[PDB]
Amino acid sequence: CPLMVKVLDAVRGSPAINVAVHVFRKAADDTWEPFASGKTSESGELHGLTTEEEFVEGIYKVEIDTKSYWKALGISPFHEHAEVVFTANDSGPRRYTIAALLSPYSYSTTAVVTN
Amino acid sequence: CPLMVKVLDAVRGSPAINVAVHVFRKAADDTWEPFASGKTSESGELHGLTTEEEFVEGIYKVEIDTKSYWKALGISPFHEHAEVVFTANDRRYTIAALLSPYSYSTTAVVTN
Amino acid sequence: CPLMVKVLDAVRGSPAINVAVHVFRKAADDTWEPFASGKTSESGELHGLTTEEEFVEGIYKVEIDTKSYWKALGISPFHEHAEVVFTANDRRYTIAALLSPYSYSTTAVVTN
Amino acid sequence: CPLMVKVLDAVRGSPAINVAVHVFRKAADDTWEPFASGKTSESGELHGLTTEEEFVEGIYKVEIDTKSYWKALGISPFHEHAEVVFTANDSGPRRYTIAALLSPYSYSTTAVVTN
Ligand SMILES: O=C(O)CCON=C1c2ccccc2-c2ccccc21
Numbered sequence: 011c012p013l014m015v016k017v018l019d020a021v022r023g024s025p026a027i028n029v030a031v032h033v034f035r036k037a038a039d040d041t042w043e044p045f046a047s048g049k050t051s052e053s054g055e056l057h058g059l060t061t062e063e064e065f066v067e068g069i070y071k072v073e074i075d076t077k078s079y080w081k082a083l084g085i086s087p088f089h090e091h092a093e094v095v096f097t098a099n100d101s102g103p104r105r106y107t108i109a110a111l112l113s114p115y116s117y118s119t120t121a122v123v124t125n
Numbered sequence: 126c127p128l129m130v131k132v133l134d135a136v137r138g139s140p141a142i143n144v145a146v147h148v149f150r151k152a153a154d155d156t157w158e159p160f161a162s163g164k165t166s167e168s169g170e171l172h173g174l175t176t177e178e179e180f181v182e183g184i185y186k187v188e189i190d191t192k193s194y195w196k197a198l199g200i201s202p203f204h205e206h207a208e209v210v211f212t213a214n215d216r217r218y219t220i221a222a223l224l225s226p227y228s229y230s231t232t233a234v235v236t237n
Numbered sequence: 238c239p240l241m242v243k244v245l246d247a248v249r250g251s252p253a254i255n256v257a258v259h260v261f262r263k264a265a266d267d268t269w270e271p272f273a274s275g276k277t278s279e280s281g282e283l284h285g286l287t288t289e290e291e292f293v294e295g296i297y298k299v300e301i302d303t304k305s306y307w308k309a310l311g312i313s314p315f316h317e318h319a320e321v322v323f324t325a326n327d328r329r330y331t332i333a334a335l336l337s338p339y340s341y342s343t344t345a346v347v348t349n
Numbered sequence: 350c351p352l353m354v355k356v357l358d359a360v361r362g363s364p365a366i367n368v369a370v371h372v373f374r375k376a377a378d379d380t381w382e383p384f385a386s387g388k389t390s391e392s393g394e395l396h397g398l399t400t401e402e403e404f405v406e407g408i409y410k411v412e413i414d415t416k417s418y419w420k421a422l423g424i425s426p427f428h429e430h431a432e433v434v435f436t437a438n439d440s441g442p443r444r445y446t447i448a449a450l451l452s453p454y455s456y457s458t459t460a461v462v463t464n
């Protein structure tokens with residue numbers, strides 16, 4: 011699995027479950043084409059977005075729908091979503107984990123990239 | 126000054142200086158219209174982006190050119206940039222970003 | 238003002254006000270001697286902890302009473318406190334802390 | 350495994366490997382008794398510190414030896430170590446993961462607690 015997303019909730023100290031994630035790839039004409047989407051599981055993970063074959067070099071945007079997450083918990087958060095944008099596979103295939111840690115007015119995101 | 130940006134460098138423990146920041150407002154057609162831009166000062170801050178008159182309710186995007194920052198330091202970064210997207214609803218907004226090569230955090234400090 | 242503390246609340250997007258902070262210096266016997274303390278202001282800051290004369294090289298601990306902060310808000314936190322331990326080596330040190338109930342980050346901004 | 354530690358390196362975007370971790374428990378006489386120790390693996394994880402039986406209620410300190418980590422990489426970091434202090438198991442047994450994300454002048458730590 012070359013692209014995985016892991017999301018944690020900093021208020022509850024738990025996985026962030028049922029978080030919607032939309033992945034896009036920057037096209038030849040410079041716009042963002044839909045690439046993959048899904049929702050985090052009970053462990054706050056999202057696997058199976060793509061395949062090695064499909065996940066070619068390019069600029070990708072991983073959009074994490076943080077607002078919908080907080081709103082469903084009664085919280086009115088600051089951000090609309092958390093967007094993570096990166097060049098992938100430009101030195102050959104790598105495995106990427108995009109981790110996000112969420113609070114209503116703050117988030118962090120870290121990439122763990124392995125070869 | 127209704128909107129301020131503060132950027133920090135977590136490798137060096139310092140303000141991130143000369144970091145380009147572009148702000149956009151979302152238009153009725155769902156595109157991002159350029160709104161404000163500048164480069165962070167010696168204190169890692171960018172003030173004077175707007176005025177209260179100009180900064181009406183709406184969805185804004187603040188794009189922080191983190192890639193160029195790291196490149197200038199000779200360090201290979203992960204992200205193309207850091208994007209911060211939020212609705213301005215009617216005080217003073219401080220968007221802060223703490224930068225590392227493969228990680229960043231962003232926090233909104235909203236005050237009167 | 239060689240040592241400043243800044244505390245932020247990541248749930249509310251605000252300075253963390255009235256947060257008690259205790260600073261200690263490590264003594265020759267490896268114990269922590271009380272050094273400075275105060276409570277954060279309305280801007281989440283604590284200034285005037287020391288002077289340059291007093292703030293000699295050595296290992297310091299800054300303890301931030303995060304548990305009491307959350308309790309006062311009716312929120313159940315994880316940590317007993319946030320501890321920040323570092324060697325002062327000879328400028329101006331700003332210890333910043335971003336607080337959430339089950340998470341915190343701390344950053345040193347060291348400048349001239 | 351009721352207590353696990355996971356450490357990531359924010360400069361390299363990788364697990365933080367061979368990080369020394371020392372765990373202490375606050376004693377009856379108010380001092381910190383050694384409780385467990387170990388080092389993170391190639392995945393940046395440390396399992397097997399304790400057992401359910403041994404990990405009774407108490408105040409614990411997880412000390413992460415961040416300085417030694419950075420120094421071994423040629424970096425002179427700000428902090429001596431990252432200390433995480435918490436009451437454990439005071440509402441019955443829980444599983445705790447103490448995650449730390451490291452940069453030379455900054456770190457964050459998050460607890461994920463499951464029942
Ligand atoms: O600061 C950020 O955004 C990153 C902070 O996330 N911490 C991460 C974390 C926390 C608890 C349990 C597992 C993981 C994990 C696994 C793989 C990759 C990253 C992380």
Ligand SMILES: O=C(O)CCON=C1c2ccccc2-c2ccccc21
Pocket residue numbers: 116131133219221222223230231232234243245331333334335342344346
């Ligand atoms: O980790 C994050 O995203 C938050 C970390 O930022 N720390 C902040 C910080 C650090 C040093 C000096 C001044 C400030 C500041 C001012 C206004 C608002 C936020 C912050």
